Design an enzyme around this catalytic site. Structure first.
Site, PDB file in Angstrom:
ATOM      1  N   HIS B 163       0.851  -1.151   0.069  1.00  0.00           N
ATOM      2  CA  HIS B 163       0.052   0.296   0.007  1.00  0.00           C
ATOM      3  C   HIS B 163       0.828   1.219  -0.042  1.00  0.00           C
ATOM      4  O   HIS B 163       1.861   1.211   0.940  1.00  0.00           O
ATOM      5  CB  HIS B 163      -1.018   0.037   1.218  1.00  0.00           C
ATOM      6  CG  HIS B 163      -2.134   1.029   1.086  1.00  0.00           C
ATOM      7  ND1 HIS B 163      -1.909   2.243   0.917  1.00  0.00           N
ATOM      8  CD2 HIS B 163      -3.416   0.742   1.069  1.00  0.00           C
ATOM      9  CE1 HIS B 163      -3.183   2.917   0.698  1.00  0.00           C
ATOM     10  NE2 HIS B 163      -4.278   1.853   0.738  1.00  0.00           N
ATOM     11  N   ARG B 429      12.877  -7.347  -7.523  1.00  0.00           N
ATOM     12  CA  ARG B 429      12.918  -6.230  -8.400  1.00  0.00           C
ATOM     13  C   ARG B 429      14.091  -5.347  -8.088  1.00  0.00           C
ATOM     14  O   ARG B 429      14.162  -4.762  -6.885  1.00  0.00           O
ATOM     15  CB  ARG B 429      11.755  -5.488  -8.454  1.00  0.00           C
ATOM     16  CG  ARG B 429      12.158  -4.367  -9.428  1.00  0.00           C
ATOM     17  CD  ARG B 429      10.775  -3.742 -10.140  1.00  0.00           C
ATOM     18  NE  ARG B 429      10.374  -3.082  -8.958  1.00  0.00           N
ATOM     19  CZ  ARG B 429       9.658  -1.668  -9.410  1.00  0.00           C
ATOM     20  NH1 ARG B 429       9.474  -1.524 -10.441  1.00  0.00           N
ATOM     21  NH2 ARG B 429       9.296  -0.924  -8.271  1.00  0.00           N
ATOM     22  N   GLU B 539      10.391   1.194 -19.245  1.00  0.00           N
ATOM     23  CA  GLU B 539       9.798   2.429 -18.602  1.00  0.00           C
ATOM     24  C   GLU B 539       9.713   3.643 -19.555  1.00  0.00           C
ATOM     25  O   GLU B 539       8.520   4.056 -19.653  1.00  0.00           O
ATOM     26  CB  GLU B 539      10.633   2.793 -17.229  1.00  0.00           C
ATOM     27  CG  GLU B 539      10.804   1.641 -16.436  1.00  0.00           C
ATOM     28  CD  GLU B 539      11.011   2.133 -14.841  1.00  0.00           C
ATOM     29  OE1 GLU B 539      10.105   2.416 -14.428  1.00  0.00           O
ATOM     30  OE2 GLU B 539      12.009   1.431 -14.244  1.00  0.00           O
ATOM     31  N   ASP B 576       4.686   4.735 -14.669  1.00  0.00           N
ATOM     32  CA  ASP B 576       6.082   4.978 -15.012  1.00  0.00           C
ATOM     33  C   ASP B 576       6.179   5.568 -16.353  1.00  0.00           C
ATOM     34  O   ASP B 576       6.840   6.443 -16.646  1.00  0.00           O
ATOM     35  CB  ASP B 576       6.801   3.574 -14.955  1.00  0.00           C
ATOM     36  CG  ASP B 576       7.306   3.256 -13.380  1.00  0.00           C
ATOM     37  OD1 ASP B 576       7.654   4.529 -12.869  1.00  0.00           O
ATOM     38  OD2 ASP B 576       7.264   2.319 -13.016  1.00  0.00           O
ATOM     39  N   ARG B 614       1.704  -1.208 -12.067  1.00  0.00           N
ATOM     40  CA  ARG B 614       0.550  -0.501 -11.802  1.00  0.00           C
ATOM     41  C   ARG B 614       0.161   0.884 -12.842  1.00  0.00           C
ATOM     42  O   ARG B 614       0.952   1.221 -13.675  1.00  0.00           O
ATOM     43  CB  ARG B 614       0.843   0.212 -10.298  1.00  0.00           C
ATOM     44  CG  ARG B 614       2.092   1.268 -10.315  1.00  0.00           C
ATOM     45  CD  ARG B 614       2.345   1.568  -8.702  1.00  0.00           C
ATOM     46  NE  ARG B 614       1.134   2.674  -8.544  1.00  0.00           N
ATOM     47  CZ  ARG B 614       0.375   2.745  -7.416  1.00  0.00           C
ATOM     48  NH1 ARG B 614       0.308   1.558  -6.587  1.00  0.00           N
ATOM     49  NH2 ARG B 614      -0.407   3.484  -7.465  1.00  0.00           N
ATOM     50  N   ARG B 741      10.082   9.189  -8.280  1.00  0.00           N
ATOM     51  CA  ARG B 741       9.386   8.061  -8.728  1.00  0.00           C
ATOM     52  C   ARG B 741       7.680   8.163  -9.060  1.00  0.00           C
ATOM     53  O   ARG B 741       7.181   9.207  -8.504  1.00  0.00           O
ATOM     54  CB  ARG B 741       9.435   6.855  -7.835  1.00  0.00           C
ATOM     55  CG  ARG B 741      10.757   6.827  -7.144  1.00  0.00           C
ATOM     56  CD  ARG B 741      11.141   5.365  -6.773  1.00  0.00           C
ATOM     57  NE  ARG B 741      11.032   4.473  -7.869  1.00  0.00           N
ATOM     58  CZ  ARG B 741      11.423   3.210  -7.750  1.00  0.00           C
ATOM     59  NH1 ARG B 741      12.273   2.733  -6.879  1.00  0.00           N
ATOM     60  NH2 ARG B 741      11.095   2.410  -8.566  1.00  0.00           N
TER      61      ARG B 741
END
Ligand SMILES: N[C@@H](CC(=O)O)C(=O)O
Ligand SMILES: N[C@@H](CC(=O)O)C(=O)O
Lengths: 915, 915
Positions: B163, B429, B539, B576, B614, B741
C-alpha cells in the site's frame, strides 16, 4: 411434486408462510431417494418407496392389512438388503427431525395474545424475557429494581445425562447441523437464485455424508459416551449463553434498568451425570469418574484457549488505566511475544499460556497419572482466571471505553463464569444399600455387630456417635468385597480431585435420615476435605410419604444442620415413582411431597432446592417446559431451578442455535416469574378428588403390573425388553418389575407404541370419579381449564397418546405373544381406548392434540417412518426368537441382530420423550 | 432524518430497493456522532457537525467562501482538538467506504442486457462465468469441450504490492468486516425485529472499537508491512478461491460438461512484491527477503494446519479402497491418536503433524537461523502434501462416494494447489544500474576494463563469453561497495532458499539485452541452482519503442533461448511510462508495444506473458477491470494474465467476500473470453490519428513538466510531495521529475485534487485533432463508441475528473504558492477545464460520469469527507511551512505533524486509484 402431494394427503397442511415443514420433508426425501438410487440401484430405491407408500396409506386409513403388506415385503429381504432398508428409514426419520427443527426455529411468534397461562404452553405464544419483566412490573406491582434483584440472585442448573439408546457421535451432529443450515438457507429471501444451485448440491452431499457415517454397534466406554454428550457445548451452548445474557441486558434497558447483569451472577450453570451415576451400573468405575473430570477440565481449557486467541485479536487498544499499565510492564519484563504498546494483549497472552498449561496438565494426567507441569503454572480455581479479565474490563471502563468492554470481553467473562474451569460439575450417584453394605463390613470388622440389622434409631445413634467421634473408623487393613471396595475407591477419587469438579452426591432409593448420615460419614472418613452436599432421591410412594418426616429429622440434628449451612437439595424422579404407583398417583404425590418438604424447610429456616429427575412435564422441552415450570407448587423454586436434561430431548433442546437460545430463555423467564407469581393453589374439592382418584389409580396399576401373575411373562413376549438388556444399549435392565429400572420400563412400552407406563391408572381414576358423582366431570374439566398442574399433567399424557398406535401393539401380540395371552393384550388395549376417551372428554377435545396442531402435525409426519421401523422390528423379533419360522427371500436387490439394533434406536429417535 | 435529508439534498437519490447507500451513511454517521459526543463532549460533536455542513454546502453549490469558512474553523483549533477532528473525518470517510462495499455487494444484477462490450464495464451488467461460457458456444461456435480445454490451460496470476500510504493493520480489517456485516444484517429481511436491537448495539460498539484503534505513526518494518498485506488471505481469499472454483463447476454442468476443473489446474495463483521489490528502496535488504519468504511459509502452513483439523472432523467415514487401507495400517503400526477404523483420519493426522513441523521449522529459522527440526520431517515440495490428499480423493471415489470427495476435500485440494506451500511467490526487483555496478566492480577487479564504459555489443560479447565459460568469475575475495555487496547478498539469498519461494526477477529501467543477460550471469555465479526467470520492465517511451528489437535479439541468442524453454515474461508500467510522456501517449505506445512484442514472440515461437504493472485500466477493480481485460490487444493474453493488485485497490477488490468472489470471477471470465474473442483491431485512420495525437500530447506534457524552468518549484509549493518524502510513508521519493518515482508523482497531485499526471496532454491532443480537421471529432466519437481500448482509456480519465476539484487546488495555491507563480497555476487550471470539456464532447456526455451513475454517486458521497481533510491539510501545510503565520486558537473543545499524516492518509483512502 408427487412426493409433496402424497405427504399433503397424509397432512391437511396450511397457508401460513411459516408452514413449510411438508416442503422441507419433500425436498429431503427427494434428495435421499436420488442418493439411494445412486448407491444401491433403482430396485432398492423402489423397494424403499414401496414400503413408504404402504406406511403412508396406513397412517391415512389405519387399515391393518397394510402392516402385513409391509411385513411381507420386509421379511422377504436377505440380511444385507434388510440392513440397507432399516438404515434408510432410520435416516429418513432423522431427516424428518432436522426439518422439524428448522420449522420450529423460524416459525413467527404471535403478536396478539391473551396473557393467560395457556399461552405459556407453546413456543409461538409464550412470554420472552422482556414480556416477563413487563408482566411483573405491570400486573404484580414490582419495581424494576425488584425484578432486577430477583434475577441477579437466581440460578438455573441444567443437569446433562446419558442418552438412553446411545448419543450421537460429535461428527454426526455437525453434519446434521449443515443439513439444517442448507435447508434454512434454501428458503432465505436474502440470498439470490445462483448462490442456491450450490446449496442444493451442498445439501445433497451432506445427506449422503450423514448416511455413510454408519458404522455399527462393544457399545461405547462411559468415557466415550461422556465426550459425545458434551458435544452441544461446541455446537450451541458455548455461544448461546453469552447471547442470551445480552438479550437479558436489552430487556433490562427496555424496562428502565440501565445496568447489566453482573458477569458473575450465576444465572446459568450446567452439571453432569455422565461418568458419575453408578447406580446399578458397574461399568462406571472409580477410574471412569477420575477420567471424566479430567476430560471436562481438558475440554473446557481447550475452549477457553481457542477463544482467547480471537479475543486477543480484537483487543488491539492501547489506552489503559495505571493498574493495567503496571501489570503489563511486569509481565513484559519477565521477557520470556507482543509489544508493550498493546497492554491488553500482554495480559491475555499470559492468560493464554496458563490455559494451555491447564490443558496439557490435564491431558498428561489422563494419559499417565503424572505431569511434568506443576499446579502452580495452571488454573486451579476459576477466580485466578477471572481476575485478569476483570482487570481488562475495569481498565477499559476507566479509560471511557465501557462500550467496548461490553462486547466480546463481556461475553468471555460470562462464559468463564457460567462454565467455570470444567464445563459441567459432576454429580455422583449410588444406591443406599451399597452404603449400608460398606457400613456393615465396618461394624462386623470392629466386632460391634451388624449395621444392616440395626434399627433406624440405632443407626442414627451410632452414626452421630462417629460423626462427633475423635477417632478414625477404618484403614486400608479393612476386609472388603469387590462392591465395598468400589464404593470406597469412589470416595477416594472425590478426596483426590479438586472440589470444583463436583456437585451433588445423590443417594438412590433414599428413605431414611441414616441414609444421608451414612454418606456424610463415609466422606469424612475417606478424607474428602470438602464434602459434596448429600441429596436423597425418594423413589417409592411410601418413600415420598415419609420424606417430609425424614427431612424434619435431619434438620433437627445439630451436626447436620451446622454442616449443611442453611442449604439442602432433595431429588425427585417422576419415572421412578410412576413405576411404583402409576403415573397419575405419582404426579399427585410429588405435588404434595414438594409442598410438604418446602413446609418443613421453612420451619427450620433451610433453603430447599428440588432437583427434578427424569420423566416430569418439565423434561418435555419447548413451550411445554415453560408452563411446566410455572405450574410448580408455590415456593418450590424460590430462585433455584435444578432440572435434568434428558438425553432423548437434548438435540431438540440444544442442537439448533435458535432453539438453544429459547431453551435458556424459557428456563430463566419461568423461574423468575414463578418466584413472584405462583400458580393458584387447588381448591379443597380438587384435593379431595385427587386423593380419591389416586387411591383408585394406584389400585388399577398395581393389580395389573404387580399382582397379575402372568404379567411379566406377557411383558417379556410383547416387548423387546429382553433384547434391550442383552444387546445392552447403555446401562443394564434389572437390579420382577420392582426390580426393573425406570428407563427400560419406559423404553419397552414405547417401542411397541403402547406406552402403558404413562397412561395406566388414569382410566380407572376418571371412570370412578364420574360414576361416583356425575358433577365430577365438570370439576375435572374446570381443573383442566384453570389449574396449571392438572393441565400440564393431562397434556403430557395426551401427547403420549398421539405417539400411540394400538394397531402396532396388536401386531406385536399376533407375532410374538402366545395365543393364551391374547385376551390379556386385548383387555389392555380396551383400557387404552377407555383411558384415552376420558382424557379427551376432560380436555374438551374431539381428537388428540386439538389444542396443539403444530405438535399434531410434527408427530403425524414422523409416524410414517417410525411405523416402518416398528413393522420391521416386530418381524425381526419373530425371526430371532423362533427358529421354526422361515420365510422366502427375494433375490438380492442392491445379520438380524444388526437390524434389530437399528430399529430399536430409530424407534427411540422417533418417540423421543414420553414418560 | 435530518442527517438523511441533508445527504439527499447533496445526492438526488433513487427509488431502487437496492439503493440504500445514503441510508447506510446516515445510520453510520448518526452512531458516529453519538460516539463522539460520549467520548469528547457535545461541543466537539457540534464542531464536527459544523465542518461537515460547510463541506456539504460546498459540494452542493461550490461557493469557494465555504472552503475559507471551514478553514477558519479548522485553523482555530489547539493541536489536541485538531487531531481529534482530523481523526473524525478520517473515520467518517472509512465508514463511507464500508457502506459502499455493502451497497456494491448486494446490488441486483440486471437480467436484460444488450450483450455488447459496454455491458462489461459495470458489475451490474457484466458477464458471469456461465454467461461467458454460453457466449463462447453460441456466438463463437466453440464446442463446450473446447471452452473447457481453454479454461483448464489458463492461469491468472495476481501480484500483491505494498500500500503506498501504509496498509491497514489486520485487526482493523476484522473490525471493518464486523461493521459491514452488522450493516448488511440490519437490512436483512430474514432476521426479525428483536434480533436487530442487538445489531444496533453491535454496530455502535464496532464503530467505536475502530475509532479507538488509532495509535499514530518509525513507520513500519517491511516485514510488518508484508504481514499486513497478507491479511486478505484470512479475510476472504482463502475461502473465496474454492468457492469460485465450485461456481465454475456449476457453470460447466449447465453447458453440458459433466466434469469439474481438475483440482490442480492452476487457474488462480498469487504472487507478491512485499519484501522483494528493492528498486530505489534500501530498507528492503537481503535479510528482509529471507524473512518474508519464511513468514509466507509459516502463515501458509499455519492455515493448512488449522483447516486440516476441520477436515479431519468431517472425514469420519470408514470405507476406503485397499490402497488407502494399506497406507493407514502402516502409519498406525508406527504407533507413536485415532482408531484404525477411521482410515481417513489416520492419513490426515499424519499430514497434520507434517504441517505442524513445517510450521515450527519455519518459525525457528526466522527467530534463530537454526532449527532442531530436520527437513526430512517437513514439506519442501507441494506434491508431498498433495499426494495423501489425492489418495483420500481416489479412495472415496473408488468406494462410490465421489459426491463426498467433491465437498470439503475438494476445496482443500484446490486451496493447496492454488496457494502451494507459501501463499504467494515472491518476485525480486532491482534496477539495471545496480547490476551494471556489480559488473563493473568485477571487470575492474579482473583488470580487463570497465563494463560500464563498454558498448552494448561488447557487453553482449563478454556476457555470452562468460555464460558459456567453464570458469567462475569471482569469489568472496571481491572488493565491493556496500551497494554491490547488497545486490550479491540478495542473489545469495535466492541461492539458499527453495525455489518455490520465488517467481520473477524484474529488472527496472530495462533497456537492453545485456540488462537481462547480466542478471542471468549473476544468478549462475551466485550459485542459484534454479534461476528465477528474468523479466525486463521497460519504462520510458524510447525504451518501449526499442523493446521489440531488444526481445528479438535476446530470442535469437542460442544460450538464452535454450535457457528460457519457450517462455518469457515482459513487464509494463503505465504510471512510469506516463511520467515520461504523459498518460495518453503512454497508453497508445503500450498498446503498440504489446502488439509488437507479441509479434516478435510469435516469430521465434516463444510464449509471451505481459505483466501489467501499476496504473493501467486493469488496475481499477470492479466492472471496469472486466472491459479492461477484454480490451487488450489480440493475442496479448493467450491464456496467461499477470496483473498487479494495487494496494490502494485491495480492500475494494478483496475485503468483502462477495466482492472477492466477483474479482476472481471477472479475471477468469475476461481472460478466457479474450483468448477466443479479441476486440476489434483499429482502423488505419484511427492508428494514424493516434500517432498524430501522441506526438502533440507528448509535446504539451513535456514542455510543461520538463522544460518549464519553474515547474519543479511550483510542484514543491502546491503539493505536499516534500512532506510525503520527509515523513516517509513507505519507500522514498526521488532516486528533477525524471528522478522522482511514479508513486510520489501520482500521490502529490491526487492530494490537491488536481491529478495533473492523468489528464495532461489529452487536451492538446484533442484540440489539435479537431482544429486540423473537424471530421476528427466524429472519428474520435466513433472510436469511443466502438473501440474498447479507447473507451476504457477515456473512462479512466473521466473517473479521475470526477475525483477532481480545481477549487481545492486553487486554495492550495492561494495559501502555499508565492504570488509570482499564480498565473502559472491558473493556466494549469484553464488546461484542466479545456481538457475536461473535450473529454466530455468525445464521450457524448454533458456531465462527468453520465454513463455510470452508481460510480457518480459513490464519488460524490465521499467528497464531503475528503474535502474537509483537504482544507485541513492545506492550512496545516501553511502552519508547518511558515513560522510568520499565526492564527488565534479557540479555548479547548473536548502536534501539526500528526495532523498532516492523518490528512495525507485520509485523502489517499478517499482518492483510491487514479493513475
Ligand atoms: N418433545 C415434544 C414431543 C416430541 O417432540 O416428541 C413434546 O413433549 O411435546
Ligand atoms: N475504483 C473505482 C474508483 C473508486 O472507487 O475510487 C474505479 O476505478 O471506478
Amino acid at each position: 411434486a408427487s412426493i409433496d402431494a402424497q405427504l399433503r394427503l397424509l397432512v391437511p397442511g396450511k397457508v401460513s408462510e411459516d408452514d413449510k415443514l411438508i416442503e422441507y420433508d419433500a425436498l429431503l426425501l427427494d434428495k435421499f431417494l436420488d442418493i439411494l438410487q445412486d448407491l444401491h440401484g433403482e430396485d432398492l430405491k423402489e423397494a424403499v418407496q414401496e414400503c413408504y407408500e404402504l406406511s403412508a396409506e396406513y397412517e391415512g386409513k389405519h387399515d391393518p392389512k397394510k402392516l402385513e403388506e409391509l411385513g411381507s415385503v420386509l421379511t422377504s429381504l436377505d440380511p444385507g438388503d434388510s440392513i440397507v432398508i432399516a438404515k434408510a428409514f432410520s435416516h429418513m426419520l432423522n431427516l424428518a427431525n432436522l426439518a422439524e427443527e428448522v420449522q420450529i426455529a423460524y416459525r413467527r411468534r404471535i403478536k396478539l395474545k391473551r396473557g393467560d397461562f395457556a399461552d405459556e404452553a407453546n413456543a409461538t405464544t409464550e412470554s420472552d424475557i422482556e414480556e416477563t419483566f413487563k408482566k411483573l412490573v405491570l400486573k404484580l406491582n414490582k419495581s424494576p429494581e425488584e425484578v432486577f434483584d430477583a434475577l441477579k440472585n437466581q440460578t438455573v442448573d441444567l443437569v446433562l445425562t446419558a442418552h438412553p439408546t446411545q448419543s450421537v457421535r460429535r461428527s454426526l451432529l455437525q453434519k446434521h447441523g449443515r443439513i439444517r443450515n442448507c435447508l434454512a438457507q434454501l428458503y432465505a429471501k436474502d440470498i439470490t437464485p445462483d448462490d442456491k444451485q450450490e446449496l442444493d448440491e451442498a445439501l445433497h452431499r451432506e445427506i449422503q455424508a450423514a448416511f455413510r457415517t454408519d458404522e455399527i454397534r462393544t457399545p461405547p466406554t462411559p468415557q466415550d459416551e461422556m465426550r459425545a454428550g458434551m458435544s452441544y457445548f461446541h455446537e450451541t451452548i458455548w455461544k448461546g449463553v453469552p447471547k442470551f445474557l445480552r438479550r437479558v441486558d436489552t430487556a433490562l434497558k427496555n424496562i428502565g434498568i440501565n445496568e447489566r447483569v453482573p458477569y458473575n451472577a450465576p444465572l446459568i450453570q450446567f452439571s453432569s451425570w455422565m461418568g458419575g451415576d453408578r447406580d446399578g451400573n458397574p461399568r462406571v468405575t472409580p477410574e471412569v469418574t477420575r477420567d471424566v473430570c479430567l476430560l471436562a477440565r481438558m475440554m473446557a481449557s481447550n475452549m477457553y484457549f481457542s477463544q482467547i486467541e480471537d479475543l486477543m485479536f480484537e483487543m488491539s487498544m492501547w489506552r489503559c488505566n495505571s493498574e493495567l499499565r503496571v501489570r503489563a510492564e511486569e509481565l513484559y519484563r519477565t521477557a520470556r511475544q507482543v509489544p508493550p504498546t498493546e497492554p491488553y494483549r500482554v495480559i491475555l497472552g499470559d492468560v493464554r499460556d496458563k490455559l494451555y498449561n491447564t490443558r496439557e496438565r490435564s491431558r498428561h494426567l489422563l494419559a499417565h497419572g503424572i505431569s511434568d507441569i506443576p499446579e502452580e503454572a495452571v488454573y486451579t480455581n476459576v477466580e485466578q482466571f477471572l481476575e485478569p479479565l476483570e482487570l481488562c474490563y475495569r481498565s477499559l471502563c476507566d479509560c471511557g471505553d465501557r462500550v467496548i468492554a461490553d462486547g466480546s470481553l463481556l461475553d468471555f467473562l460470562r462464559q468463564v463464569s457460567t462454565f467455570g474451569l470444567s464445563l459441567v460439575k459432576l454429580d455422583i450417584r449410588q444406591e443406599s444399600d451399597r452404603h449400608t453394605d460398606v457400613l456393615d463390613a465396618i461394624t462386623q470388622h470392629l466386632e460391634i455387630g451388624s449395621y444392616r440389622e440395626w434399627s433406624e434409631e440405632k443407626r442414627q445413634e451410632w452414626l452421630l456417635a462417629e460423626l462427633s467421634g475423635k477417632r478414625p473408623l477404618f484403614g486400608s487393613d479393612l476386609p472388603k468385597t469387590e462392591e465395598v471396595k468400589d464404593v470406597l475407591d469412589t470416595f477416594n477419587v472425590l478426596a483426590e480431585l479438586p472440589s470444583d469438579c463436583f456437585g451433588a452426591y445423590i443417594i438412590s432409593m433414599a428413605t431414611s435420615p441414616s441414609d444421608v448420615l451414612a454418606v456424610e460419614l463415609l466422606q469424612r472418613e475417606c478424607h474428602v476435605k470438602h464434602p459434596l452436599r448429600v441429596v436423597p432421591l425418594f423413589e417409592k410412594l411410601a418413600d415420598l410419604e415419609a420424606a417430609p418426616a425424614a427431612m424434619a429429622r435431619l434438620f433437627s440434628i445439630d451436626w447436620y444442620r451446622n454442616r449443611i449451612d442453611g442449604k439442602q437439595e432433595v431429588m425427585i424422579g417422576y419415572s421412578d415413582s410412576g413405576k411404583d404407583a402409576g403415573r397419575f398417583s405419582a404426579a399427585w404425590q410429588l405435588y404434595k411431597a414438594q409442598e410438604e418438604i418446602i413446609k418443613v424447610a421453612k420451619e427450620f429456616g433451610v433453603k430447599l432446592v428440588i432437583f427434578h429427575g427424569r420423566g416430569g412435564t418439565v423434561g418435555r422441552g419447548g413451550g411445554p417446559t415453560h408452563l411446566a415450570i410455572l405450574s410448580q407448587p408455590p415456593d418450590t423454586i424460590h430462585g433455584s431451578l435444578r432440572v435434568t436434561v434428558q438425553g432423548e430431548v437434548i438435540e431438540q433442546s440444544f442442537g439448533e442455535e435458535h432453539l438453544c437460545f429459547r431453551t435458556l430463555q424459557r428456563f430463566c423467564a419461568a423461574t423468575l416469574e414463578h418466584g413472584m407469581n405462583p400458580p393458584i393453589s387447588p381448591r379443597p374439592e380438587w384435593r379431595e378428588l385427587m386423593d380419591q382418584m389416586a387411591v383408585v389409580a394406584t389400585e388399577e396399576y398395581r393389580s395389573i403390573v404387580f399382582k397379575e401373575p402372568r404379567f411379566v411373562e406377557y411383558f417379556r413376549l410383547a416387548t423387546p425388553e429382553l433384547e434391550y438388556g442383552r444387546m445392552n444399549i447403555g446401562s443394564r435392565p434389572s437390579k420382577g418389575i420392582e426390580s426393573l429400572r425406570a428407563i427400560p420400563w419406559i423404553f419397552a412400552w414405547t417401542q411397541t407404541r403402547f406406552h402403558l407406563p404413562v397412561w395406566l391408572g388414569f382410566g380407572a381414576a376418571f371412570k370412578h370419579a364420574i360414576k361416583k358423582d356425575s358433577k365430577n366431570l365438570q370439576m375435572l374439566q374446570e381443573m383442566y381449564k384453570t389449574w396449571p398442574f392438572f393441565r400440564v399433567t393431562i397434556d403430557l399424557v395426551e401427547m403420549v397418546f398421539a405417539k400411540g398406535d394400538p394397531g402396532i401393539a396388536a401386531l406385536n401380540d399376533k407375532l410374538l405373544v402366545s395365543e393364551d395371552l391374547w385376551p390379556f393384550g386385548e383387555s389392555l388395549r380396551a383400557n387404552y381406548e377407555e383411558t384415552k376417551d376420558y382424557l379427551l372428554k376432560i380436555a374438551g377435545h374431539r381428537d388428540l392434540l386439538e389444542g396443539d396442531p403444530y405438535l399434531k402435525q410434527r408427530i403425524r409426519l414422523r409416524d410414517s417412518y417410525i411405523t416402518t421401523l416398528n413393522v420391521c422390528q416386530a418381524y425381526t423379533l419373530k425371526r430371532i426368537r423362533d427358529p421354526n419360522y422361515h420365510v422366502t427371500l427375494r433375490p438380492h436387490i442392491s445379520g438380524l441382530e444388526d437390524t434389530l439394533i437399528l430399529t430399536m434406536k430409530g424407534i427411540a429417535a422417533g418417540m423421543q420423550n414420553t414418560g
